[PDB]
């Protein structure tokens, strides 16, 4: 009847550190760690912390800011934050960990092309949302994709997202030209991770050899049992000119319709 209209300028994110409870350590990087815990003892959550004197507390909070502006079912959802050191970033908890570990774990060996292409579609949808919001991820890879119940996949790690050479587009790694298109290149590399059970891209090739090679026009071959049509999509993602590469909007549609429109004769196999 009579709605509250006053006192709404309150920060819908900030919360008291006392309401948090870090339980299990799930991750650890250069600028902090990730823990699983409870938000007010009743909500299981994920908390990304920061290692003191490893990054400006102001810079760290940037990933939090981006996450305040971006909302989508295929993006990890931010729940709350603690902007005062020790700084904490609270988000929904993804039960199956990173896509990378899922792929090379025991439950990954049973995955086949239909599930794998579907996951790519989910990721593409997430990136499509980022795409239309005029943002760039800069670090799209399997290690930065989170998996949840029912194999839902969500883009995470927007630490370096604003308005690793084996995953980075040439122009981006060489001249710092990070765009949604250098992100499309990354998705292409990600597609190889999905079709090889998480194998590292460019097998047997060191970082410096990779740059030389890709500049000389080298591109990874079609993975074993991977339909040539899918490899062709990867090659479109790795086109030299960033503007030749497809949009995530295009990729999302292509993958969602894959098995009826592109690979109608698909038949199961030993690994894909
Ligand atoms: C590294 C790993 C796989 C343990 N990890 N990292 C995050 C994560 C937490 C906060 C932000 Cl802001 C971004 C990602 C995460 C999560 N929510 N749920 C499960 N595992 C997670």
From Swiss-Prot:
Its EC number is 2.7.10.2. The modification Phosphotyrosine is found at residues 175, 266. Keywords: ATP-binding, Cell adhesion, Cell cycle, Cell junction, Cell membrane, Cytoplasm, Cytoskeleton, Endosome, Immunity, Kinase, Lipoprotein, Membrane, Mitochondrion, Mitochondrion inner membrane, Myristate, Nucleotide-binding, Nucleus, Phosphoprotein, Proto-oncogene, S-nitrosylation, SH2 domain, SH3 domain, Transferase, Tyrosine-protein kinase. The modification S-nitrosocysteine is found at residue 237. One of its GO terms (molecular function) is protein phosphatase binding. It is found in: Cell membrane; Mitochondrion inner membrane; Endosome membrane; Nucleus. ATP binds at residues 26-34, 48. Becomes activated when its major tyrosine phosphorylation site is not phosphorylated. It can also be activated by point mutations as well as by truncations at the C-terminal end or by other mutations. Heme regulates its activity by enhancing the phosphorylation on Tyr-266. Expressed to high levels, and with a high degree of kinase activity, in certain fully differentiated cells such as neurons, platelets and macrophages. Isoform 1 is widely expressed. Isoform 2 is expressed only in the muscle. It catalyses: L-tyrosyl-[protein] + ATP = O-phospho-L-tyrosyl-[protein] + ADP + H(+). Residues 20-259 form the Protein kinase domain. Forms a complex with polyoma virus middle T antigen. Interacts with AFAP-110. Interacts with GJA1 and PXN. Non-receptor protein tyrosine kinase which is activated following engagement of many different classes of cellular receptors including immune response receptors, integrins and other adhesion receptors, receptor protein tyrosine kinases, G protein-coupled receptors as well as cytokine receptors. Participates in signaling pathways that control a diverse spectrum of biological activities including gene transcription, immune response, cell adhesion, cell cycle progression, apoptosis, migration, and transformation. This is Proto-oncogene tyrosine-protein kinase Src. It comes from Gallus gallus. The chain holds residues 251 to 533 of 533 of the full protein.
